[PDB]
Design an enzyme around this catalytic site. Sequence first.
Site, PDB file in Angstrom:
ATOM      1  CE  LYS A  16      -5.003  55.343 -22.204  1.00  0.00           C
ATOM      2  NZ  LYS A  16      -6.451  55.501 -21.839  1.00  0.00           N
ATOM      3  CE1 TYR A  85       9.383  37.655 -23.835  1.00  0.00           C
ATOM      4  CE2 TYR A  85      10.642  35.630 -23.610  1.00  0.00           C
ATOM      5  CZ  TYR A  85      10.049  36.565 -24.403  1.00  0.00           C
ATOM      6  OH  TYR A  85      10.137  36.390 -25.768  1.00  0.00           O
ATOM      7  CB  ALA A  86       4.533  35.047 -21.356  1.00  0.00           C
ATOM      8  CG  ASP A 129      -9.371  43.104 -18.704  1.00  0.00           C
ATOM      9  OD1 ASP A 129     -10.245  42.369 -19.209  1.00  0.00           O
ATOM     10  OD2 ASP A 129      -8.932  44.121 -19.289  1.00  0.00           O
ATOM     11  CD  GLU A 133      -7.469  42.873 -25.721  1.00  0.00           C
ATOM     12  OE1 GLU A 133      -8.095  41.774 -25.788  1.00  0.00           O
ATOM     13  OE2 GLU A 133      -7.930  43.963 -26.139  1.00  0.00           O
ATOM     14  CG  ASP A 147      -5.923  43.999 -14.246  1.00  0.00           C
ATOM     15  OD1 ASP A 147      -5.370  45.005 -13.725  1.00  0.00           O
ATOM     16  OD2 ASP A 147      -7.110  44.021 -14.664  1.00  0.00           O
TER      17      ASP A 147
END
Length: 247
Positions: A16, A85-86, A129, A133, A147
């Site tokens: 968003k 970075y994952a 959270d 995702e 989060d």
Amino acid sequence: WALEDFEIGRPLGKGKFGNVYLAREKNSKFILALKVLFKAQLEKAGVEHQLRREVEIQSHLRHPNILRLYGYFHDSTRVYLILEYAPLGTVYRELQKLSKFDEQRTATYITELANALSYCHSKKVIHRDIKPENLLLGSAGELKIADLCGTLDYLPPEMIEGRMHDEKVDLWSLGVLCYEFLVGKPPFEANTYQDTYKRISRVEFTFPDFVTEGARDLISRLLKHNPSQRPMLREVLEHPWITANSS
Ligand SMILES: CCN1C(=O)C(C)(C)c2cc3[nH]c4c(c3cc21)CCCc1c(C)n[nH]c1-4
């Protein structure tokens, strides 16, 4: 620190408020994730204060299973977050590929999260959270925390009812996640909002056939209506089903 100290690459996700891009720091060639947020959009939602709050918190958190925040800077029209970075992407995508996870994968993920949340709770950080995702996968396949319309399932009964609320909310979330991992869908999802709320409020759900006695036991304990009856994170780690199945 500034934008020209970074080689911006491909976009990894579209939020968003702004995008996240894969990138390298020009000097070192250190791979990282650069999250760009547009200031005007932040100010339109009235969340510039909640953003500063996340950033303060995340910068003071160092755990291998919590996504690291290396720094941040801002220009006239944008805010930039320099992030770990994952390399292996989101658990959401993994779950869409595999449909559901087996017990060894799930127990290992839950272990990693129990540790992540213990660290958090210990730093008086609560309610992170943890829906699929918002979980990334690091170099060793290890998971990392990072989060109305959304999935109510993850909200415990005391939050949807506007009652007093605790660290115990993460335990509820963890039980929902454990179910979603094993089954492929969360336990309370319904055709309407009202039915979902009802299901959560009464903890009405059923297990499919294939879920073993140990998994049922753990999930049942985490999804207790009374937050006080939910186990501690330590008791989750020491749960037979977790210790039997975790790596
Ligand atoms: C676009 C799908 N995709 C991939 O195919 C691979 C595996 C390359 C991948 C890695 C990734 N890492 C991260 C993301 C991501 C996405 C993907 C999403 C953005 C948030 C983020 C942060 C804050 N850090 N890392 C990550």
